Design a protein around this ligand. Structure first.
Ligand SMILES: Cc1cc2nc3c(=O)[nH]c(=O)nc-3n(C[C@H](O)[C@H](O)[C@H](O)COP(=O)(O)O)c2cc1C
Ligand SMILES: Cc1cc2nc3c(=O)[nH]c(=O)nc-3n(C[C@H](O)[C@H](O)[C@H](O)COP(=O)(O)O)c2cc1C
Lengths: 195, 195
């Protein structure tokens, strides 16, 4: 009962895997633009789209990033031809007059700092979900990484900005032995119930 | 430079919209099963997949849900043939010996309650993004809802369970006048930069 055809199902989900090694082949800016142009449409609360991205391309910036990556993740991050650092824009409310223009008081739903931060991180995580699918849609492999120090990455790449660094995503064509055996997924009956 | 074909791009993102009205047509359990079977493969940190789902299908449960939904969202939530309530399993570390078996001490990364809650919510948000794409992959329309009282919903549908209710998703075939004009999206140059 799926409308999405099987080949698309395989590319995005069924045969898509997290890459642990990458080919060094350069990933072009035009490639990432095409991915963003596709998945920017994925919905966020009040269209608030708080995700901001820094493409850590140069060896210089990659070495600066690696000092904040846990040792067990440095192999992958160092070998990826492209690394995306995602941060949640804590000033997203200021964009709502133009992004959610028919509710002019929308920004004020987030006057509380905790509510603003929690909404920024939640919708940036939502967008990370879209982004992972978008990377796969671009024929590439995604290797998300949470084992890093967000404060150091903030100082390094977003100094003085009102953001919350949330994620690192290795992007590239897979290298040799990039994939380990698929791990378990919970059964439907363990996850879903009806009332 | 997208490997995903154009028809799939349109179904999942480019021509997919958030539905504000729904046809009453019943959505069967097998339909949701096919959707979960597809998007359960979407990756989460340490394979921790904390999303848990209650399908609020019956009128009885829907009325109980609606008391916790903000006035301005009751119209949508009441008319959807199916509503999914998403919660983050705060006890997900207990499942890691099984789900992330090659790292037996993984669960101790979440000894701290805030670290555990933040991880549960972040990865449930990731899974919500996959789930939205999956609902569209199933030929349906998704209508996510954040304007509700999470504690009230927890008491109704997850009483005494160690979860954090995070999101409501209206699911169905779209009704008449389900969609308004697409809103703006930030430019690539506003979201992404390189170093
Ligand atoms: C996490 C999330 C929460 C949302 N909560 C509400 C809500 O409470 N009320 C509402 O009317 N729409 C809600 N929406 C719908 C968004 O406003 C909508 O998806 C966004 O404006 C983009 O619209 P589009 O998908 O048609 O392009 C929510 C969307 C998301 C992603
Ligand atoms: C948010 C997130 C953070 C992750 N962080 C790490 C990490 O720090 N180190 C690592 O080796 N893998 C990391 N991963 C990869 C996950 O372990 C992996 O995606 C999961 O085990 C599923 O693998 P699969 O896509 O091949 O099925 C992360 C994945 C996600 C989604």
């Amino acid at each position: 009962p799926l409308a999405l055809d099987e080949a698309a199902q395989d590319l995005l989900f069924r045969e898509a895997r997290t890459a642990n090694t990458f080919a060094p082949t350069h990933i072009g800016d035009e490639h990432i633009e095409a991915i963003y142009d596709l998945v920017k449409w994925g919905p966020t609360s009040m269209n608030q789209q708080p995700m901001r991205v820094v493409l850590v391309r140069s060896d210089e910036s990659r070495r600066a990033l690696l000092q904040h990556v846990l040792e067990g993740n440095r192999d992958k991050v160092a070998s990826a031809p492209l690394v995306a650092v995602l941060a949640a824009d804590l000033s997203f409310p200021d964009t709502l007059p133009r992004l959610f223009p028919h509710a002019p008081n929308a920004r004020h739903a987030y006057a509380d700092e905790n509510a603003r931060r929690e909404s920024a991180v939640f919708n940036t995580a939502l967008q990370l979900g879209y982004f992972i699918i978008g990377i796969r849609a671009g024929g590439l492999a995604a290797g998300p990484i949470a084992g890093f120090d967000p404060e150091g990455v903030h100082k390094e790449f977003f100094p003085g900005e009102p953001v919350l660094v949330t994620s690192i995503v290795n992007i590239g064509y897979p290298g040799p032995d990039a994939f380990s055996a698929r791990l378990p997924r919970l059964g439907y009956r363990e996850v879903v119930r009806s009332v």
